[PDB]
């Protein structure tokens, strides 16, 4: 080699200053991993090269990485790995790259493919909805002649080295090397690696309205597997790559593409438009405003900046969204610790308004639109044969709902077959199915939010308040709060409405999403004899007043009456169940029932 190797070596003296700040980093990450492994009685080989250390002072070496990314990366690895041993060889796995930074206009939205940069560096974002299997793969197996005690060596190359199209080895395992010895193979010293494909859709808001979402796929490696839950705003970066013989491997080859698009990439990141690290400053201010004894009320009014009133509804949403705990019974069935509120109202009274903006601040809680095909909580045994001999129970809609919220619409405008499914997932946290395959109890922590409409217009007052939708009481008994939104007409009421819609055709949100997601990590009190003494008195008088009046209540309603106040103390961020929480819990039900 002298021409193709010279600017390697000139870089081999160049980039060693481009890890003046990382040559500490790459050895500090292993010296304790070498230490703790010797005193057990763990991290991969990630070497994040920024742009900044390779753009401030190298230009010929720079643009080679963004024009021809095929003669440069295995140079960068081979010159990396000697520094692993030249730093660390006394105690007795190739350290590939990641390359974070910016890029300067390669945010190819994959609705667009490129004519300029094929076989180059690409930055891609979107959502994944495939999540295929996991399967290991060999790279190097070592053979051993059991007679004469001598060893052997063999490496298999594949379409996995990411860059060099070597002569493949169309072989699985050889036998009988040039001797009369029956070949033995040591599998502890044979190395493996995994292999997982995933398809990425289009972020369906920035693709303009002329098409359905498109998709491509990406092969990643072990370092960031099981990181990709289906429904994450992911952002990957890798090389663009074609493989496969198009036009010769079969004869006459008419109308068959033979150039599959692939991405053999690295370093995914979740984004947000779970990881939000805050400093000492904002963590102290949120304690400083915690000292105020009004902030439960301020958060109610600072949520929906368009609509008047409904402060009973507005406190309920933030009470539900933050969530109440479920303490599992030891060697016993745990109870309902989910909360599940419901609405109904005569039309155009903002029943669906506030239902869509809970999805923006959802904190990884992606909901459906309530279109009630069978698949709302199940699998329907969709396997697609998974490359000839693998059957997979593909996750329909509960792998996204776990420790999150959902919302569905149009209950009475549904068939029967969804209603039997919402029976099971409410009485029990899990679904278990055996369609043409395996019985499997997979767990789910869900919390529905409902929206239906009454049937006969404005007939609520002149008839019974109950049966007003007459969907089965299997769900009404499994739900707690049936807010009936009024629309009464008062000349000061509507006049106030008329300007407030008009004033908006022309205490903050990201602080709000931090406060709740910090409050999911604080301890749960549950324990004060004072607060439990007053609520049962508060129950008994309405236990005299439920049956001689509107609506009969049951024992599970008491498990609400702990749970609302339990979450109400989670707003307080304290470990003492106070007295003041028990007054808002009683008063909220009093409007919900009267």
């Amino acid at each position: 080699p002298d021409a193709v190797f010279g600017d390697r070596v000139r870089r081999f003296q160049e980039f060693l200053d481009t890890f003046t700040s990382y040559r500490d980093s790459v050895r500090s990450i292993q010296v304790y991993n070498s230490n703790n492994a010797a005193n057990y009685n763990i991290l991969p080989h990630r070497i994040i090269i920024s742009l900044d250390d390779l753009r401030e002072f190298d230009r010929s070496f720079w643009s080679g990485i963004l024009v021809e990314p095929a003669y440069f990366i295995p140079p960068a690895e081979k010159a990396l790995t000697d520094l692993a041993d030249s730093m660390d060889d006394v105690p007795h796995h190739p350290w590939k790259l990641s390359f974070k930074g910016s890029f300067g206009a390669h945010a190819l939205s994959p609705r667009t493919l490129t004519a300029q940069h094929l076989n180059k560096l690409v930055s891609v974002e979107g959502i994944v909805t495939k999540t295929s299997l996991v399967r290991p793969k060999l790279i190097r197996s070592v053979h051993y002649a059991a007679k004469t005690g001598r060893f052997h060596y063999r490496d298999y190359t594949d379409a996995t080295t990411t860059l060099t199209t070597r002569i493949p080895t169309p072989a699985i395992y050889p036998t009988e090397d040039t001797e009369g010895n029956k070949l033995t193979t040591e599998y502890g010293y044979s190395t493996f690696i995994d292999h997982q494909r995933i398809t990425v859709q289009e972020m369906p808001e920035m693709a303009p309205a002329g098409q359905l979402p498109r998709s491509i796929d990406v092969i990643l490696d072990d370092d960031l597997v099981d990181k990709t839950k289906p429904g994450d705003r992911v952002n990957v970066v890798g090389v663009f790559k074609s493989l496969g013989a198009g036009g010769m491997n079969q004869s006459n080859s008419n109308t068959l593409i033979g150039f599959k698009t692939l991405i053999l990439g690295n370093t995914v990141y979740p984004l947000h438009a779970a990881r939000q690290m805050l400093t000492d400053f904002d963590i102290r201010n949120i304690n400083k405003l915690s000292k105020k004894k009004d902030i439960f009320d301020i958060l109610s009014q600072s949520l929906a900046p368009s609509i008047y009133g409904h402060d009973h509804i507005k406190k309920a949403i933030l009470l539900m969204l933050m969530g109440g705990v479920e303490k599992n019974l030891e060697n016993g069935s745990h109870l309902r610790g989910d909360i599940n509120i419901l609405m109904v109202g005569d039309p155009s009274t903002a029943k669906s308004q506030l239902l869509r903006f809970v999805l923006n601040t959802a904190s990884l809680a992606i909901a459906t639109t309530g279109r009630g095909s069978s698949g709302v909580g199940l699998t329907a045994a969709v396997t697609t044969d998974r490359e000839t001999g693998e059957r997979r129970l593909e996750a329909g809609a509960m792998v996204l709902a776990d420790r999150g919220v959902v919302c569905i619409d149009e209950f009475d405008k549904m068939t029967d077959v969804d209603r039997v499914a919402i029976h099971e997932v409410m009485e029990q946290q899990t679904v278990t199915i055996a369609k043409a395959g395996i019985h499997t109890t997979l767990n789910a922590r869900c919390s529905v939010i409902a929206a239906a409409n009454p049937v006969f217009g404005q007939y609520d007052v002149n008839r019974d308040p109950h049966q007003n939708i007459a969907l089965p009481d299997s769900l009404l008994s499994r739900f707690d709060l049936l807010f009936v939104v009024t629309d009464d007409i008062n000349e000061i009421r509507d006049r106030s409405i008329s300007e407030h819609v008009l004033r908006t055709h022309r205490v903050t949100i990201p602080f709000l999403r931090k406060y709740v997601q910090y409050a999911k990590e604080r301890v749960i009190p549950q324990l004060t004899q004072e607060a439990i003494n007053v609520i049962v008195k508060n129950y008994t008088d309405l236990r005299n007043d439920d049956n001689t009046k509107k609506s009969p209540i049951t024992a599970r309603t008491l498990e609400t009456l702990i749970r609302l106040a339990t979450a109400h103390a989670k707003v307080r961020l304290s470990k003492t169940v106070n007295k003041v929480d028990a007054k808002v819990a009683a008063n909220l039900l009093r409007f919900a029932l009267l």
């Binding site: 399967r135 290991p136 793969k137 060999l138 298999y156 594949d158 379409a159 169309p170 699985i172 395992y173 599998y187 493996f192 292999h195 490359e387 000839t388 001999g389």
Partner: protein, 79 residues
């Protein structure tokens, strides 16, 4: 170790690991997929009439109390 497992056994197996070749349609498909299994070595199963049990049959005979203590015995978790 055969004939010693059951559907529904909350158990654990200890055993040794090896992958296996596929030897079918290995060129077009089946490039270097592996589809391993594990090979078993040991099973440590868990949570399983006048034969050293008569002492507790006497505890009902000596104490008596059929109509009420046994009534409080099954399902004492209601009102």
């Amino acid at each position: 170790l055969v004939r010693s497992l059951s559907p529904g056994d909350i158990v654990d197996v200890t055993g040794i690991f090896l992958p296996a070749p596929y030897t079918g349609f290995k060129a077009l498909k089946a490039g270097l997929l592996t589809e391993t299994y594990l090979e078993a070595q040991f099973v440590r199963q868990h949570k399983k009439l006048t034969s050293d049990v008569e002492e507790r049959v006497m505890e009902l005979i000596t104490s008596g109390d059929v109509y009420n203590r046994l009534a409080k015995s099954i399902a004492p978790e209601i009102y």
